[PDB]
C-alpha cells in the first residue's frame, strides 16, 4: 500500500510484548527484520537498541548459516545515520573468518575490499597496526596486495596522485553498490579526503622535525584557510601536537623540554661508548687465535 512509518510502528508495538522468550528461532529472525523496518523508517535509535539484545545472546549460541549472515548486513546498514567507519571495521572481524572457513574465496575476496574501505576511512585507532598483517593475507592475490598497499600508502602519500588512484581502480572507492548507500558519490570523496589528510599529518610530524609552512601547504593539497582547519582539529582532539607560526611561516615538531636535559638524555652518550668494552671482549679472544697460529 506504500506505507513506511505505519508498517514499522505495527511490529514495534507488538513483537516487544509478544514473545515470552520461548522459541528463539522465529524471535531472533524477526528482530533482525524488525531492524530493517527502522532503516526504511529512518530511526537509528530503534535499530541501535535492538542491536544490544540478541547480538550478545547470538555469540553464546552456535554459528548458523542464514542467521549469522543477517548480522553482517544490518551492522553495515546502521552506518548510514552513524557514518562511523571505525565501529563497522570491528563488526567485520567475524565475517572475515567466516568467508575464509565456512565459505570460499569467492565471497571472501570482495568482503576483503570492504574491510579495507572501513579501515582507510577510519579516523584513528589502536587496532590499525594490527589490521595491517591480519591473518589470511599474503595469499598472492591482486586485490589483496592492492588494498594492503593503500594501508601503508598514508606514510609516503603526497596527495598528488590521490584523485588519480581512486579513478583508475574504484572497487570500494568511487562506485560501490555493496555495503553502501546514498544518492551520489559525494560521500565517497568527502569522507576519504578528510581521512587521508588526517593520516598524512601523523607521519609528517614523525619524520620532519622543522618544515616551512609554505612548503607544507603544497603537500596537503589545500589553501591557507583549509590547512588551518585540519591542524586545529588534530590538536583539539588530542591526536598530534606541533608548532604553527603564521607570521614566521615555520612549522616545528614541538620537542618536549621536560626531559630534564642531562638527567635523561645523557643516557644516549654512555651508550655511544658502551658497546666498545663488549666488542673488545670478543676481539681479544678471536685476535690471539688467528694471529698467533
Amino acid at each position: 500500500e506504500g506505507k513506511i512509518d505505519e508498517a514499522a510502528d505495527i511490529l514495534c508495538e507488538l513483537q516487544v510484548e509478544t514473545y515470552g522468550s520461548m522459541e528463539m528461532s522465529e524471535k531472533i529472525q524477526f528482530i533482525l527484520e524488525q531492524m530493517e523496518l527502522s532503516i526504511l523508517k529512518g530511526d537509528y535509535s530503534q535499530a541501535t537498541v535492538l542491536s544490544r539484545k540478541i547480538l550478545k545472546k547470538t555469540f553464546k549460541n552456535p554459528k548458523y548459516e542464514s542467521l549469522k549472515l543477517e548480522y553482517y548486513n544490518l551492522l553495515v546498514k546502521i552506518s548510514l545515520h552513524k557514518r562511523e567507519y571505525l565501529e563497522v571495521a570491528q563488526y567485520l572481524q567475524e565475517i572475515y573468518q567466516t568467508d575464509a572457513i565456512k565459505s570460499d574465496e569467492a565471497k571472501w575476496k570482495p568482503v576483503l575490499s570492504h574491510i579495507v574501505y572501513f579501515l582507510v576511512l577510519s579516523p584513528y585507532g589502536n587496532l590499525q597496526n594490527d589490521l595491517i598483517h591480519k591473518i589470511q593475507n599474503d595469499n598472492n592475490l591482486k586485490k589483496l596486495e592492492s588494498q594492503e598497499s593503500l594501508v601503508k600508502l598514508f606514510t609516503t602519500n603526497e596527495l598528488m596522485r590521490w584523485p588519480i588512484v581512486q579513478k583508475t581502480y574504484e572497487p570500494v572507492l568511487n562506485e560501490d553498490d555493496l555495503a553502501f548507500g546514498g544518492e551520489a558519490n559525494k560521500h565517497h570523496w568527502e569522507d576519504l579526503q578528510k581521512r587521508v589528510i588526517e593520516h598524512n599529518l601523523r607521519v609528517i610530524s614523525e619524520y620532519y622535525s622543522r618544515i616551512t609552512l609554505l612548503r607544507l601547504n603544497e603537500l596537503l593539497d589545500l589553501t591557507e584557510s583549509q590547512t588551518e582547519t585540519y591542524i586545529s582539529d588534530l590538536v583539539n582532539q588530542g591526536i598530534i601536537y606541533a608548532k604553527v607560526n603564521r607570521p614566521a611561516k615555520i612549522v616545528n615538531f614541538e620537542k618536549p623540554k621536560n626531559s630534564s636535559q642531562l638527567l635523561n638524555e645523557w643516557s644516549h652518550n654512555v651508550d655511544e661508548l658502551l658497546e666498545h668494552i663488549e666488542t673488545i671482549g670478543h676481539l681479544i679472544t678471536k685476535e690471539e687465535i688467528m694471529h698467533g697460529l
Binding site: 537498541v49 544490544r52 539484545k53
Partner: protein
C-alpha cells in the same frame, strides 16, 4: 519537605542518569511527601530498573510512573488497612 525544595535531591540524582526529553520530573515532587534522601535515591534507581526491564538505556516517562508505584510504601504498615480504629 516541599514540592520545589525536594528538587535539589530528585534533580541531582536525575543529572547522573540518562533521561528522555518526555520524562516528567514534576510528578515525583507532587505526590511524594517527606522522603529521606535514601528513599528518594531508590526512586530514581527503580526507574532505571524499569528501563533495563524494557531493554532500554534511557529512562522514559512511564518508567518514572512505574517506579513510584513500587515506592508508595514508605513507613512499615500492612497495606492501607493499618491504623485500627
Amino acid at each position: 519537605r516541599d514540592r520545589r525544595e525536594r528538587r535539589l535531591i530528585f534533580g541531582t540524582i536525575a543529572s547522573k542518569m540518562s533521561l528522555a526529553p518526555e520524562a516528567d520530573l514534576d510528578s515525583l515532587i507532587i505526590r511524594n511527601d517527606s522522603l529521606s534522601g535514601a528513599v528518594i535515591a531508590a526512586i530514581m534507581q527503580e526507574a532505571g530498573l524499569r528501563a533495563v526491564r524494557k531493554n532500554r538505556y534511557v529512562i522514559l516517562q512511564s518508567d518514572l510512573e512505574e517506579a513510584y508505584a513500587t515506592q508508595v510504601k514508605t513507613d512499615n504498615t500492612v497495606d492501607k488497612f493499618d491504623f485500627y480504629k
